[PDB]
Design a protein around this motif. Structure first.
Motif, PDB file in Angstrom:
ATOM      1  N   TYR A   6      -5.576  -2.129  -1.879  1.00 48.27           N
ATOM      2  CA  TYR A   6      -4.270  -2.759  -2.014  1.00 48.27           C
ATOM      3  C   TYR A   6      -4.097  -3.290  -3.433  1.00 48.27           C
ATOM      4  CZ  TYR A   6      -3.101  -2.533   2.951  1.00 48.27           C
ATOM      5  OH  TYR A   6      -2.792  -2.095   4.216  1.00 48.27           O
ATOM      6  N   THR A   7      -2.916  -3.842  -3.697  1.00 50.72           N
ATOM      7  CA  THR A   7      -2.591  -4.433  -4.991  1.00 50.72           C
ATOM      8  C   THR A   7      -2.082  -5.848  -4.762  1.00 50.72           C
ATOM      9  OG1 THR A   7      -0.345  -3.547  -4.969  1.00 50.72           O
ATOM     10  CG2 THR A   7      -2.062  -2.181  -5.965  1.00 50.72           C
ATOM     11  N   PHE A   8      -2.816  -6.829  -5.277  1.00 51.30           N
ATOM     12  CA  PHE A   8      -2.399  -8.218  -5.198  1.00 51.30           C
ATOM     13  C   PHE A   8      -1.525  -8.588  -6.390  1.00 51.30           C
ATOM     14  CE2 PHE A   8      -3.239 -12.667  -6.437  1.00 51.30           C
ATOM     15  CZ  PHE A   8      -2.588 -13.278  -5.387  1.00 51.30           C
ATOM     16  N   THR A   9      -0.590  -9.503  -6.150  1.00 52.96           N
ATOM     17  CA  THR A   9       0.319  -9.979  -7.182  1.00 52.96           C
ATOM     18  C   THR A   9       0.849 -11.344  -6.761  1.00 52.96           C
ATOM     19  OG1 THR A   9       2.319  -9.491  -8.448  1.00 52.96           O
ATOM     20  CG2 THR A   9       2.262  -8.825  -6.133  1.00 52.96           C
ATOM     21  N   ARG A  10       1.761 -11.884  -7.566  1.00 50.61           N
ATOM     22  CA  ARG A  10       2.400 -13.161  -7.280  1.00 50.61           C
ATOM     23  C   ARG A  10       3.898 -13.034  -7.044  1.00 50.61           C
ATOM     24  NH1 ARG A  10       2.934 -17.132 -10.150  1.00 50.61           N
ATOM     25  NH2 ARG A  10       2.618 -18.653  -8.469  1.00 50.61           N
ATOM     26  N   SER A  63       0.852  -1.186   0.000  1.00 51.70           N
ATOM     27  CA  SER A  63       0.000   0.000   0.000  1.00 51.70           C
ATOM     28  C   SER A  63       0.887   1.236   0.000  1.00 51.70           C
ATOM     29  CB  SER A  63      -0.943   0.011   1.202  1.00 51.70           C
ATOM     30  OG  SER A  63      -1.882   1.067   1.097  1.00 51.70           O
ATOM     31  N   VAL A  64       0.930   1.936  -1.131  1.00 48.52           N
ATOM     32  CA  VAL A  64       1.654   3.198  -1.269  1.00 48.52           C
ATOM     33  C   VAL A  64       0.751   4.161  -2.035  1.00 48.52           C
ATOM     34  CG1 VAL A  64       3.978   2.314  -1.010  1.00 48.52           C
ATOM     35  CG2 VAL A  64       2.883   2.177  -3.198  1.00 48.52           C
ATOM     36  N   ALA A  65       0.113   5.075  -1.313  1.00 48.38           N
ATOM     37  CA  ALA A  65      -0.920   5.929  -1.876  1.00 48.38           C
ATOM     38  C   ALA A  65      -0.361   7.282  -2.309  1.00 48.38           C
ATOM     39  CB  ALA A  65      -2.051   6.135  -0.869  1.00 48.38           C
ATOM     40  N   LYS A  66      -1.161   7.990  -3.106  1.00 47.14           N
ATOM     41  CA  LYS A  66      -0.861   9.351  -3.533  1.00 47.14           C
ATOM     42  C   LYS A  66      -1.280  10.337  -2.452  1.00 47.14           C
ATOM     43  CE  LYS A  66      -2.432   7.310  -6.590  1.00 47.14           C
ATOM     44  NZ  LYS A  66      -2.554   5.844  -6.812  1.00 47.14           N
ATOM     45  N   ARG A  67      -1.342  11.623  -2.796  1.00 43.76           N
ATOM     46  CA  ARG A  67      -1.902  12.630  -1.896  1.00 43.76           C
ATOM     47  C   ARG A  67      -3.408  12.391  -1.844  1.00 43.76           C
ATOM     48  NH1 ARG A  67       1.991  16.657  -1.130  1.00 43.76           N
ATOM     49  NH2 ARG A  67       0.624  17.169   0.634  1.00 43.76           N
ATOM     50  N   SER A  68      -3.802  11.453  -0.984  1.00 43.40           N
ATOM     51  CA  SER A  68      -5.142  10.889  -0.994  1.00 43.40           C
ATOM     52  C   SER A  68      -5.772  10.982   0.387  1.00 43.40           C
ATOM     53  CB  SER A  68      -5.115   9.425  -1.453  1.00 43.40           C
ATOM     54  OG  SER A  68      -4.260   8.650  -0.632  1.00 43.40           O
ATOM     55  N   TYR A  69      -7.083  11.214   0.406  1.00 41.31           N
ATOM     56  CA  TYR A  69      -7.833  11.301   1.649  1.00 41.31           C
ATOM     57  C   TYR A  69      -9.246  10.793   1.394  1.00 41.31           C
ATOM     58  CZ  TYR A  69      -9.858  13.267   5.941  1.00 41.31           C
ATOM     59  OH  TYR A  69     -10.503  13.439   7.143  1.00 41.31           O
ATOM     60  N   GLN A  70      -9.838  10.188   2.427  1.00 39.06           N
ATOM     61  CA  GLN A  70     -11.078   9.408   2.399  1.00 39.06           C
ATOM     62  C   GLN A  70     -10.924   8.109   1.620  1.00 39.06           C
ATOM     63  OE1 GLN A  70     -13.140  10.971   4.357  1.00 39.06           O
ATOM     64  NE2 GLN A  70     -13.477  13.106   3.759  1.00 39.06           N
ATOM     65  N   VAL A  71      -9.775   7.882   0.986  1.00 36.96           N
ATOM     66  CA  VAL A  71      -9.452   6.641   0.295  1.00 36.96           C
ATOM     67  C   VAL A  71      -7.951   6.684   0.047  1.00 36.96           C
ATOM     68  CG1 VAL A  71      -9.814   7.532  -2.031  1.00 36.96           C
ATOM     69  CG2 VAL A  71     -10.089   5.082  -1.585  1.00 36.96           C
ATOM     70  N   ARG A  72      -7.313   5.521  -0.062  1.00 38.47           N
ATOM     71  CA  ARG A  72      -5.875   5.446  -0.316  1.00 38.47           C
ATOM     72  C   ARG A  72      -5.657   4.524  -1.512  1.00 38.47           C
ATOM     73  NH1 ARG A  72      -2.601   9.015   2.518  1.00 38.47           N
ATOM     74  NH2 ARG A  72      -1.038   7.388   2.909  1.00 38.47           N
ATOM     75  N   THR A  73      -5.788   5.077  -2.715  1.00 37.75           N
ATOM     76  CA  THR A  73      -5.471   4.319  -3.917  1.00 37.75           C
ATOM     77  C   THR A  73      -3.958   4.234  -4.094  1.00 37.75           C
ATOM     78  OG1 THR A  73      -5.964   4.093  -6.285  1.00 37.75           O
ATOM     79  CG2 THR A  73      -5.641   6.343  -5.432  1.00 37.75           C
ATOM     80  N   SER A  74      -3.468   3.031  -4.377  1.00 39.96           N
ATOM     81  CA  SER A  74      -2.047   2.728  -4.330  1.00 39.96           C
ATOM     82  C   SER A  74      -1.463   2.578  -5.728  1.00 39.96           C
ATOM     83  CB  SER A  74      -1.791   1.449  -3.524  1.00 39.96           C
ATOM     84  OG  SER A  74      -0.448   1.018  -3.668  1.00 39.96           O
TER      85      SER A  74
END
Length: 240
Positions: A113-117, A14-25
């Motif tokens: 979050y972002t899922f991966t393998r 989880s690494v978000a932008k300048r984000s508030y009320q949500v944290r898109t990564s």
RNA sequence: AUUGAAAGAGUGCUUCCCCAAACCCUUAACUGGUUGUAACAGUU
């Protein structure tokens, strides 16, 4: 000229932008997160030079040393080979950092979050010494978390790969300042950590779908004269 | 040690209680294993 290549089968970050009320990564880990993880590993190994009055300035000087040993600020790169996708998680995160409003103030933030393998991470250096190369090789492990502490990371193996100067399509990240002539992705991931400058990164990762969603994969890589081979396939890391 | 350090969508909730697939309902009825046929002939 050697490249520190590390394999980690981490599930999430989880690494978000300048984000508030949500944290898109971000779709891929930023260079700042990778540098912070390596600094954490170095501190865990031996705080013979990372121990001082405060943790903030200790981390600052660790990142400064890492940047000094790297070729430049935008040096460490990340490249996936498995189809990674972006999902959403609703967690009650505290928002007491605002103006006043007591301390137990918490709201259900959509901390997605972002899922991966599996991903490859490459560090670029300037012919570091054998003792320091061993120190960084043992510091390539101990990456026990990426981004936030809610999602951790797990390295598999670490190696010192050579550029070998072979022409092949690339898959790792590269700054967009010098890459113009090269299905294309581009954003800003804050390559410089902030501890209290203006650049944009490029990623060769497209969107794709299954039914109505986007699972990010790689197609049509550009052509770069610098590339190497590992694990039976071919990857490409930009060199300044 | 990472736009990351702290981080409960979480805390209580009987899909519940009541309610006979239930009630009336002769495979039932009519109808022969039936009819004819030497263990027979002949034997110290």
């Amino acid at each position: 000229m050697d490249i520190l290549l590390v394999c980690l089968r981490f599930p999430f970050f989880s690494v978000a932008k300048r984000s508030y009320q949500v944290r898109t990564s971000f779709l891929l880990p930023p260079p700042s997160a990778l540098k912070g993880a390596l600094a954490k590993g170095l501190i865990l190994l031996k705080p013979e030079k990372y121990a001082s009055s405060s943790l903030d300035e200790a981390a600052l000087k660790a990142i400064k040393e890492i940047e000094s040993k790297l070729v430049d600020i935008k040096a460490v790169s990340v490249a996936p080979l498995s189809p990674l996708i972006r999902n959403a998680f609703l967690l009650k995160r505290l928002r007491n950092l605002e103006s006043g409003s007591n301390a137990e103030k918490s709201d259900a933030m959509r901390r997605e979050y972002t899922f991966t393998r599996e991903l490859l991470v490459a560090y670029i250096f300037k012919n570091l010494t054998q003792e320091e190369k061993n120190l960084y090789l043992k510091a390539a492990m101990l990456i026990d978390v990426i981004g936030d502490t809610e999602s951790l990371a797990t390295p598999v193996w670490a190696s010192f790969v050579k550029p070998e100067d072979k022409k092949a399509p690339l898959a790792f990240s590269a700054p967009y300042t010098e890459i113009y002539s090269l299905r294309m992705y581009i954003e800003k991931m804050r390559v410089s950590p902030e501890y209290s400058q203006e650049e944009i990164f490029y990623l060769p990762i497209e969107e794709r779908r299954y039914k109505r969603i986007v699972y990010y994969a790689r197609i049509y890589p550009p052509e770069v004269e610098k590339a190497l081979t590992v694990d039976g396939e071919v990857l490409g890391i930009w060199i300044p």
